[PDB]
Design a protein around this ligand. Structure first.
Ligand SMILES: COc1ccc(F)cc1[C@@H](C)Oc1cc(-c2cnnn2C)cnc1N
Length: 285
């Protein structure tokens, strides 16, 4: 089984196999926190009880992640496929996944400024850079969403990175309906503009502080809503310029939507506008 990315073909043999003795599991997080000799790592494990397909899936996932080279995509430290159970070793992202972080770190009476608008813009900017990298390398992610993003740490130095490529893995060889543009439902045509649409939904998730998109709508209701021109309202307290980026991401015609270079440019503008970043987030009770 080969994998083609950018200007290079690669196989299992090119994967950096780490001697099993050098790998220690520290605790569960099927993922564990681990150590390699000392590098902190996350360990994704393939269950020994699985089918042939699970094994090629696991292998293709390792190939995919191992070929990426960008600071906003989680690194693959290596693999251990010659011992059971098989491991994929990933950069350990201590802040956890983005969706959970937004829900746990919402401004509250016990910590009214735990998070501010600039923090959310930096996360959006980080993922957008990741996405620009995928775009310019002609890789379509297909599942951009907060559940698939990770943070290096809880505190103010945090960096957001794209952390899961399972959907792209399957496609290479379960539509995330609420993150999908109209043409995906009706034409099944996918483009980097597909990711642009998803990023807009991700933006909404971020600035809502981790709400489910289209609150109160089922998948089919969303599908009909969006196909007929409907769009989400801004998240509570969302700055007008940030909502504008979302709605630009959600233009009905793919070609009307910005590429990620333009998105990054507009997020930076937002970061430079004091009227945006001086906006307070809602305090939750
Ligand atoms: C549930 O796992 C995921 C969820 C979403 C993703 F995008 C990637 C992963 C997995 C494959 O990767 C990591 C997980 C964590 C983590 C999660 N919760 N706490 N921690 C400490 C840290 N670093 C990773 N590399």
């Amino acid at each position: 089984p080969n994998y083609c990315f950018a200007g290079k073909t690669s196989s299992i043999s090119d994967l950096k196999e780490v001697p099993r003795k050098n790998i220690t599991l520290i605790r569960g997080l099927e993922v564990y926190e681990g150590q390699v000799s000392p590098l902190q790592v996350a360990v994704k494990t393939l269950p020994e009880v699985c089918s042939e397909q699970d094994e090629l899936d696991f292998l293709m996932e390792a190939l995919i992640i191992s070929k990426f080279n960008h600071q906003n995509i989680v690194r693959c430290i290596g693999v251990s496929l010659q011992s059971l159970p098989r491991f994929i070793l990933l950069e350990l992202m201590a802040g956890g996944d983005l969706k959970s972080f937004l829900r746990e770190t919402r401004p509250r009476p016990s910590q009214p400024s735990s998070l501010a608008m600039l923090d959310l813009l930096h996360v959006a900017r980080d993922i957008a850079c990741g996405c620009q990298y995928l775009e310019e390398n002609h890789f379509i992610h297909r599942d951009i969403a907060a559940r698939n993003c990770l943070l290096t740490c809880p505190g103010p130095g945090r960096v957001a990175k794209i952390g899961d490529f399972g959907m792209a893995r399957d496609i290479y060889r379960m539509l995330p309906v609420k993150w999908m543009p109209p043409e995906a439902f009706m034409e099944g045509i996918f483009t980097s503009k597909t990711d642009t649409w998803s990023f807009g939904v991700l933006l909404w998730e971020i600035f809502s502080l981790g709400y489910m998109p289209y609150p109160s709508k089922s998948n089919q209701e969303v599908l009909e809503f969006v196909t007929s021109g409907g769009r989400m309202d801004p998240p509570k307290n969302c700055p007008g310029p940030v909502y504008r980026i979302m709605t630009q991401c959600w233009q009905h015609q793919p070609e009307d939507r910005p590429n990620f270079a333009i998105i990054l440019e507009r997020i930076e503008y937002c970061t430079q506008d004091p009227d945006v970043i001086n906006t307070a987030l809602p305090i939750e009770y």
